[PDB]
Structures are given as C-alpha cells and as structure tokens.
C-alpha cells in the first residue's frame with residue numbers, strides 16, 4: 007500500500023528471480039541421460055553370457071570375481087598405446103582404483119565352551135579392530151596397509167557401517183589386457199579372505215561434448231554373517247565452468263546473489279541491536295534468519311569447494327595416475343541439498359505478500375490461528391506414532407525388511423496410510439499380535455485421528471470468520 | 482501438588498530410559514541380514530537345475546522328495562577327518578539335523594456301507610485319537626518305530642491346519658553329505674511317505690561364532706487329508722552365552738535396575754490401594770498401571786524360567802555328535818519378545834498423563850476424555866455392521882477366494898479394503914451376482930456414512946468443550 | 958456308570974451357540 011512494502015516486494019521478486027535463474031542453470035537435461043546410460047552399462051549388464059546375474063543382484067564372492075573380470079572390463083575398455091572412449095564420447099580419465107578394507111583375526115572373545123571347535127573370529131567392521139599387517143606375497147601395495155592420510159581418503163558411510171579411507175589398494179592400468187592380468191594375479195593369490203569387510207572401485211569419465219565430469223564409485227560390503235551387499239554412486243560435476251558466455255552470466259548472477267545476501271544480513275543485524283530486541287516472536291523473522299543462515303552456509307561451501315581444484319591440476323600434469331574426485335562430489339551433493347532447501351524456503355516465503363483482498367486475508371488469519379492447536383495435537387499424534395513404530399520394530403524387526411530399522415518402521419507406517427503395504431509378510435511373521443497391530447493402527451489412524459484434525463480446522467475457521475465479520479461489521 | 486508431580490515425572494522418565502536401553506540392547510545391530518541370508522539360502526533356491534519350484538511353492542510329495550535330496554543338502558553341507566561344515570564359511574552347523582514324520586492309521590474313517598466295494602482305505606484327518614502307533618515297512622530302526630513325546634523331549638507346534646504332537650517317526654541325519662544322501666535315498670526307496678502321512682518336520686541349528694547369536698531352523702510340511710502340500714518355516718536367532726563383553730554386563734545391570742523399579746511400582750501400588758480409594762478403578766490411569774505391572778512381572782518370570790533352563794546347551798557341549806534340542810528356548814524367546822513389545826508400547830502410551838502444561842493441551846485431553854463415551858457408543862454399532870459384512874462374506878465367498886477362507890481373514894480383508902488394498906478380479910469371478918453388490922455397498926456405507934458420523938461426533942464434542950471453557954474463562 | 962469324555966473330533970458349535978444365545982437374551986431381558 008505504501009512505499010516500504012512496495013520496496014520489500016520488489017526486492018523479494020528480484021531475489022527470487024536471481025535464485026530461479028541460478029537453480030535453473032545447474033539442473034538442465036542431458037545430465038539425467040548421462041548417468042542413465044552409465045548405470046545401464048555398468049549395473050544391468052550380466053556378469054557373463056552364461057549367467058543372468060548382474061551387479062545389482064550379487065550374492066557371493068565368486069560372483070564378485072566374475073563381475074570384476076566380466077562386465078566391468080567390457081564396460082571400461084572400448085576399442086576404436088590408445089585411450090578408451092566409453093560411448094565413443096566419454097573419455098576414461100587416468101586409471102581406475104580398487105581398494106579393500108579388512109579386519110584382523112582374533113578381534114573377538116570366543117566363549118570358553120566352544121573354544122575347542124572354532125579357532126577364527128573376525129569382528130564386524132570398526133576402526134579399532136581393523137587389520138594393519140601385510141599378508142600373502144607382501145611385495146606390492148595390494149598387500150601393504152596404507153593409512154588414510156597417505157591415500158587422501160575420507161569416510162563413506164556405507165549401508166552397514168561407516169568405512170575409513172585407508173585400506174589395501176591397487177591402481178589398475180589403461181589397457182584391458184594389463185588390467186585383466188593384474189586382476190587374474192590378484193585373484194590367484196587369494197586377496198578376499200574371510201577378513202575382508204568392504205571393497206571399492208573408483209573411476210571417472212569426461213564426455214567433452216558437454217562440459218561435465220562423471221565420477222563412478224561401486225561398493226561391495228561383506229557382513230560378518232556372510233553374504234554380499236552392493237551399492238553404487240554416479241555423480242556429475244562441472245569444474246571448468248568459464249567456457250561459454252552462459253557461464254559468465256551465471257557468475258554474474260552468483261555475484262548479485264552474494265550482494266543480496268550481504269544486504270539482507272546487514273539489514274537483519276541492524277534491526278536487532280536496540281530496536282525490537284528479541285524480535286524472534288514472529289514467523290516471518292525466523293524464516294528470514296533461516297534463509298540467511300542457509301544462504302551463508304551455501305556460499306561458504308561454494309567458496310571452500312571451488313577454490314579446491316588442485317586435484318584437477320595435478321591430474322592434468324600427469325595423466326597416468328588416479329584422479330581423486332571424491333571430495334568434490336561429496337561437497338557438490340551437500341551444496342545441492344542446501345540449495346534445494348533454501349530455494350524451497352524462499353518460495354514458501356511468498357505468503358508474506360498475498361494479502362491484496364479480504365479473502366486472502368481471511369484465509370491467512372485462519373491458517374495463522376490454526377498453528378497452535380495443530381502443533382498441540384501433533385505432539386500427541388507423534389507420541390502415538392512413535393509408540394506404534396517401536397512396537398512394530400520390536401515385533402517385525404527381523405523378518406519383514408520394512409520394519410528392519412526404526413526410521414524404516416516410521417516410513418513403512420507412513421506408507422501404510424497410503425495403502426501400499428503387502429500385509430502378506432507381516433501376516434506370516436507373527437500370526438497373533440501381527441494382525442492385531444495392523445487392524446488397531448488402521449482403526450486409530452483413519453477413524454479417530456484424521457477426524458480430530460478436521461474438527462480442529464473446522465472450529466478454528468468458523469471462529470475466525472465470526473470474529474472477522476464482527477470486527478468488520480461494527481465500524 | 483505439582484512438587485510431587487515433579488518427582489513422579491522424574492521417576493517415570495528414569496523408568497522409561499531404562500526400558501528404552503533394555504529394548505535397544507535386546508534388539509541389537511543388524512541381525513536381520515543373518516536370517517535374510519539363511520532364509521534366501523533355504524527358501525528361494527530352486528529344488529534342481531531344471532525345476533523352477535522352491536520350498537515356498539511346493540505342490541506335491543515328489544517335489545518334497547526332490548527338495549530333501551537336493552536344495553536342502555546343497556545348502557546344508559559346505560566343503561572347505563570328516564570335517565565340520567560352515568554354511569557361509571562363518572556359520573557352524575551344530576551336531577546333526579533331524580527329520581520327523583506324523584501319520585495316521587488305516588481304518589480311522591468309516592466309509593458308507595453301500596460304497597464299501599470300490600474303495601477300502603480311508604485315512605482320517607490328523608488327531609491324537611487316530612494317530613498311528615505301529616511299525617511299518619522294513620521295521621529296522623527309529624524311522625519305522627513309534628517314539629513317545631516324552632522320549633523325544635518334544636512339544637506341540639500349532640501348525641496351520643492343526644496342532645501337531647511332539648511324537649512320531651524320526652531319523653537323525655549325519656555330519657557329511659554322502660551319509661545323509663545315502664540315508665535319504667534309503668528312506669525314499671523303501672517308501673516312507675505314503676498316503677497315511679500328515680506332517681513332516683526338519684530341524685537344525687547353526688552358531689555363527691563371529692557375533693554371539695545361535696540360529697534355530699525348523700521347516701514344516703503339512704499334507705492335509707483332502708490332498709495338497711502346505712509349507713512353512715521358522716528361523717529364530719537366540720543368545721545363550723550372554724556374558725561375554727562389557728555391554729553384556731551393562732545390560733545385566735540395566736536388568737536388575739528394571740527389576741528394582743518394578744518392585745518399587747508394586748510396593749507403591751499396594752500401599753496406595755490398601756489405605757484409601759478401595760474402588761480405585763474409576764480413573765483409567767490406574768488400570769494402565771496394573772496392566773503394566775502384570776505384564777512386566779510376567780516378563781520377569783518368563784526370563785527367569787528361560788535363562789536358567791540352559792541345561793540342553795550343557796548336554797550338547799559334552800557330545801557334539803547328537804541333535805541339539807533348541808525349540809523350547811526359541812518358543813519362550815518369541816513369547817518374551819511379544820510380552821516385552823506390548824509392555825514397552827503401554828509404557829509409551831502412559832506418557833499422556835504428564836503432557837498438561839498450558840491451556841491448549843488441557844482442552845485436547847478434556848475433549849478426548851469427553852468424546853470417548855460417545856465414540857464407544859457409536860463404535861458398538863459400527864462393529865456390529867462390520868461383523869455382519871464379515872460373516873456374510875465368509876459364508877458366501879469363503880470357499881473360493883483364498884482371502885475369505887477364515888473369519889479373521891475376512892476381517893483383515895475388509896480392513897485392507899478400507900485402505901484400498903483390494904483386487905477386484907477374484908471377488909468378482911467367485912460370484913457374478915452378490916459379488917459386486919457386496920463390494921459396492923460395503924465401500925459406500927463405510928466411506929460415505931460410517932466414517933463421517935465419527936467426525937460429526939468428534940467435532941460436536943470439541944466445539945462444545947472449547948466453547949464452554951472459553952465462556953467460563955471470559956466470564957470470571 | 959460315568960465316563961470321562963475323550964478329546965475326539967474338533968469342536969461342536971450347536972451347544973456353544975445355544976448357550977451364547979441363552980446368555981445374551983438373559984442379559985438383555
């Protein structure tokens with residue numbers, strides 16, 4: 007209505023436009039199909055012609071040895087020393103690297119009763135109980151422990167545990183024959199014993215047509231109870247930004263965003279010095295603080311990341327080594343998460359300005375006055391939800407793999423509401439107290455707790471309309 | 482008033498954190514993968530290279546014979562003087578497995594007199610009255626001789642078709658694959674599973690010394706009198722050598738702390754019920770207390786009777802060439818787990834007694850307690866209608882659909898229909914008429930009428946509660 | 958002249974239904 011709110015609206019629209027451009031300029035198409043073709047080539051390909059097993063359905067160590075000498079070498083090396091082009095467009099950078107992590111024999115306390123029959127025990131993976139000694143023909147780097155600081159590694163947080171960056175590693179070759187010979191000699195002298203706990207394969211490609219590196223990491227975990235758990239990660243990155251004019255445009259937009267964030271920071275700091283000290287009793291101020299801190303964190307991450315390109319320069323100095331691009335991919339994932347969260351919050355900040363008439367004002371007031379009761383009832387709702395989740399975890403937590411973990415129990419309970427749970431497995435997991443849980447949960451969610459939310463909303467909306475009508479009609 | 486409420490809340494919070502620690506300890510890190518690998522090794526493997534059938538989809542008796550000398554022997558014995566067997570190079574096979582058969586006698590079924598010319602043998606359904614107790618075939622050893630339940634150290638099972646006794650004709654297999662294959666071939670040649678058989682059990686156990694966790698495996702196959710085969714399985718992880726590491730001592734300390742807390746609660750309950758409020762049951766916050774106390778006392782008693790009866794482990798450890806009996810321990814472990822889960826659920830529900838610190842939370846509790854009566858009154862009618870539909874579906878579709886075969890299955894199918902988890906093909910092909918009528922009328926009268934009346938009642942109660950508190954507060 | 962019944966058959970519903978109906982009508986009346 008007056009000039010200050012108009013200025014605020016104009017500034018907010020400019021900031022939103024800047025964010026929209028910045029987010030659109032980093033999530034274009036042709037990035038999905040890149041990773042899609044890579045995944046189809048490496049994951050879905052059967053390990054050999056005579057077997058229908060692939061990487062996604064590995065089941066034993068012999069299957070892993072078949073995959074390593076099979077679909078991996080077919081998907082890495084393509085014929086036109088010579089360089090390898092994956093799809094005649096994707097260039098394999100340097101050499102791939104394989105690395106295993108293992109524990110030491112005697113990391114247990116075998117019970118005295120059975121000490122006469124079982125002699126070997128290997129604990130589950132832990133930093134305090136991992137092997138650091140040579141084994142086999144202790145000549146190369148595949149039979150000698152190398153510390154984390156000497157490998158430039160970092161943690162991974164796999165499915166079972168969080169694995170260290172150290173281990174026993176081997177750098178493969180640039181040609182298929184040498185890599186095949188290396189893997190054959192690594193398999194003949196048994197490299198994966200009963201102590202092996204994890205295995206990693208890492209490499210990267212370039213695809214010079216577009217400007218996008220791709221980093222590939224494949225992990226295989228061997229639990230202490232026997233078996234194989236495979237997982238994968240394909241991640242595209244951009245490290246040579248300033249190649250075209252659009253990149254300069256994006257850099258200018260980034261500088262403008264930095265200026266906007268500085269202006270918002272100085273405004274917020276100038277507000278709470280004496281004026282309305284402890285002004286945190288408003289929603290639109292806490293939202294601004296959250297947006298500011300998230301943007302500052304994102305800016306700091308971007309500055310600390312883009313200034314770390316020494317690995318690329320080192321690889322470009324000598325193109326016969328292993329390119330180490332895992333940290334860049336990790337920080338890119340973190341930056342993407344932060345950017346998505348902050349863009350979501352700046353988008354939902356738009357409700358501060360949609361009050362142009364009486365209908366929008368009435369709806370906004372109703373939503374504002376529903377917050378307290380909805381939170382008060384959500385406390386009870388989540389208490390009941392957590393009690394049910396704990397019961398389901400304790401009952402089905404070893405057979406149904408929808409309740410195999412507490413957070414998995416919560417997600418399964420949320421999916422039950424949508425009615426996409428089989429109920430066939432939880433029937434046979436426990437014939438009594440299994441169906442009881444399901445029926446009682448359905449009855450108490452659909453009949454007692456949804457209607458309570460609806461009743462609260464109805465009453466609050468009616469009261470707000472009555473109060474607003476009385477206020478408006480008594481001038 | 483609130484000063485003692487603070488002490489009560491502190492004691493309840495200590496009890497809750499102790500119980501949470503105990504439940505986290507009892508449900509340890511991922512032992513899901515243990516049972517996952519065991520099941521997928523024994524349940525999903527096809528019985529042979531050519532056949533695509535496995536244990537979960539057995540169809541006839543010949544399929545069972547193929548599985549026995551087949552996927553079972555492949556998954557039992559692994560090569561690495563008559564050496565033991567490690568199933569995944571980690572899990573040690575304890576002793577030998579055992580197979581057992583339950584059968585009925587010929588003549589326990591009276592056929593009509595006018596039909597006693599074309600048929601002469603009828604085998605009744607399984608019952609302890611009609612169970613066979615006589616030698617048959619080449620009567621040489623324990624496979625052709627009846628052994629009593631008390632001579633087998635067995636117990637009932639409560640399978641799917643019926644409840645099976647702990648007796649029958651049993652055979653202990655060997656440690657090597659060749660001996661077991663020869664024994665199974667000898668059983669198959671001198672026919673062992675005839676028309677009189679009614680149930681077959683296979684039992685064994687493994688250790689997996691890396692973690693400290695035994696596993697007991699029991700596979701059951703039921704042959705109903707009407708024909709067919711019904712398979713079922715039971716994998717149970719146990720811990721019988723508890724005191725090994727420091728965390729075990731920590732869990733023992735938490736256990737005795739829990740026992741002291743339960744004793745304290747019992748003493749408080751008795752002291753308060755003795756002196757005043759001899760009625761004591763018009764609160765709903767005291768029935769919860771007695772329920773929790775009873776459940777915890779039963780759990781403590783089960784734990785005491787279960788952990789002290791580990792004599793079977795001692796007998797096995799002095800002779801490792803015999804079948805170890807671990808079924809009773811698995812049964813009591815399952816019972817203890819169920820009771821502990823119910824107890825922890827009720828302890829969590831008990832937290833509602835203390836969430837009252839402002840006007841917003843007080844009015845919600847008041848609304849719930851006030852509308853509980855009306856909700857119960859309407860829920861009586863709701864459940865009467867629900868059971869009417871359930872019995873109609875059981876009587877009409879109960880013999881064709883595989884989902885209305887039992888009354889409880891009808892109830893669960895209706896509850897799934899509420900969620901939209903139903904497939905219309907089977908319910909329709911079972912009956913051209915009265916099929917669509919049932920489904921349509923059920924959905925309409927359940928979503929358009931019964932679901933909205935609950936909302937009507939709840940909204941009216943909440944509105945009146947809020948209005949009367951607001952009027953009282955604004956006019957005082 | 959008195960014989961302990963054996964656990965034969967499975968279960969009979971006629972007697973149970975009659976007793977349940979009698980108890981229910983008694984309670985309502």
Ligand SMILES: *[C@@H]1O[C@H](CO)[C@@H](O)[C@H](O)[C@H]1NC(C)=O
Nearest residue numbers: 110111112113124125126127
């Ligand atoms: C493993 O540890 C046990 C513990 O005493 C030892 O006896 C054995 O020699 C070690 N090595 C192997 C290969 O078992």
Ligand SMILES: *[C@@H]1O[C@H](CO)[C@@H](O)[C@H](O)[C@H]1NC(C)=O
Nearest residue numbers: 155156157158320327328330
């Ligand atoms: C780790 O980084 C340093 C930095 O130059 C490099 O010299 C070294 O070779 C790297 N480690 C490996 C195993 O290549």
Ligand SMILES: *[C@@H]1O[C@H](CO)[C@@H](O)[C@H](O)[C@H]1NC(C)=O
Nearest residue numbers: 586587588589600601602603
């Ligand atoms: C079963 O018993 C009948 C007599 O009721 C007899 O005729 C028939 O041969 C028997 N069948 C056997 C033993 O297989």
Ligand SMILES: *[C@@H]1O[C@H](CO)[C@@H](O)[C@H](O)[C@H]1NC(C)=O
Nearest residue numbers: 628631632633634796803804
């Ligand atoms: C039953 O247990 C006793 C020990 O209480 C044992 O001697 C006997 O052999 C067991 N039964 C069988 C069939 O092994």
